[PDB]
Amino acid sequence: TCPFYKKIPGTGFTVDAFQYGVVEGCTAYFLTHFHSDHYAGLSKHFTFPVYCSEITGNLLKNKLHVQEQYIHPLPLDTECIVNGVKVVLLDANHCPGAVMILFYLPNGTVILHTGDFRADPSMERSLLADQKVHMLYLDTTYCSPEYTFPSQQEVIRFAINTAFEAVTLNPHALVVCGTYSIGKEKVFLAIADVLGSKVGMSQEKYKTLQCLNIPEINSLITTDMCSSLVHLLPMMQINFKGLQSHLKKCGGKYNQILAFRPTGWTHSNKFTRIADVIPQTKGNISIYGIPYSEHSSYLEMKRFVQWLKPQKIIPTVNVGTWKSRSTMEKYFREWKLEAGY
Ligand code: NI
Known part of the structure; x- marks a missing residue:
């Protein structure tokens, strides 16, 4: 009731x-x-x-x-x-x-x-x-x-700068961003724009994005994973096992992954400034949790x-x-x- x-x-x-x-x-x-x-x-x-x-x-x-x-x-x-x-x-x-x-x-x-x-x-x-x-x-x-958490603008600045530095040091790095619902599209769109790439994703997520009236969207997203160096994956796959398995699938095109998990607030917001955020790393895989809030x-x-x-x-x-x-x-x-x- x-x-x-x-x-x-x-x-x-x-x-x-x-x-x-x-x-x-x-x-x-x-x-x-x-x-x-x-x-x-x-x-x-x-x-x-x-x-x-x-x-x-x-x-x-x-x-x-x-x-x-x-x-x-x-x-x-x-x-x-x-x-x-x-x-x-x-x-x-x-x-x-x-x-x-x-x-x-x-x-x-x-x-x-x-x-x-x-x-x-x-x-x-x-x-x-x-x-x-x-x-x-x-x-x-x-x-x-x-x-407490930073402005959306500060969080995007951190993400663009992090991604652009990484890929400029290593042109063979893949960027991956997690998603499980609509919202927070700016994270993956801003990173793909700095890198001169479209965003690659599943047919189901491409479909969802096509409903959103974002300007010039046909210019920013694609289902052709091979043509893209920013990929979207389900949030559940953003861990060392899931990312290792994804890297296997890319046909030796890449030798490193840098991945982003947009969360809401986490208790590390109690201690660490956005500027000071560091990833978790295992071998050739790094994962950043970034406090991008829509509340x-x-x-x-x-x-x-x-x-x-x-x-x-x-x-x-x-x-x-x-x-x-x-x-x-x-x-x-x-x-x-x-x-x-
Ligand atoms: Ni909601």
Whole structure:
């Protein structure tokens, strides 16, 4: 049965609620982004209206085979009436196609559902600036002060510089990057651009990337592995055994691998600056864990919420333990007392 924090009061609407069967009283199912914990339950047999971004709608139709007649894509930054209620979709600065949803309830209440997001000061100048929000359904993934990581720009700078140095020292090195979902495409695209290579990958991943409206994409990716010196592999294969086995398959073209594992936060963020990061190495194989996050840091989260000044906060992440819930509620009260709302 559908939990309370996925229902929007005073509407027929649910958010990211496809794994509960037919939800009583739901006339429209919103989907914030195409990540599996959120789309869990959708297939070609789904027969209710789904509201989402154009990019999420491309993935629904091509990857999950949802029939076209039940996909309702909405443009961003645009007031739209859905089943008699005004809604707006905003960019969530998460993965491609990810949105936040503003709902303007018939009784005058305004609700923001962030989906998954990486808060940014640029959001303070979206359509959020123009009016008050009463309730915030908040992505609280890293809601604790220990969660620090660098900007995405710093992380990409480190990766480009590392890859370009390695391959310039040894023109016979292969670069490999791990993936298990959409998001974080900048990691492998920026490295392939510095090296003058396309990115090589499986037919299934090429298919997924072709749904994302990235400009000039036919110029950046390929299924011809032999023509590429940046390869994408499943995240599970990014270990010494899996990489050794991949190197065997490349027909003696290469004699070294440099591999990247984009993770979220890891406890080595407590001690080591991005500049100082070092790989794990075994023989002719090196593996870098790089803290490329598509979720808010604690400080980014706090800044957003103190700017928005919501009357009530409903967390959507870390909601299963009393310890987590009590910790989050303590930070929300701190933020409110400090800023004075
Ligand atoms: Ni996500």
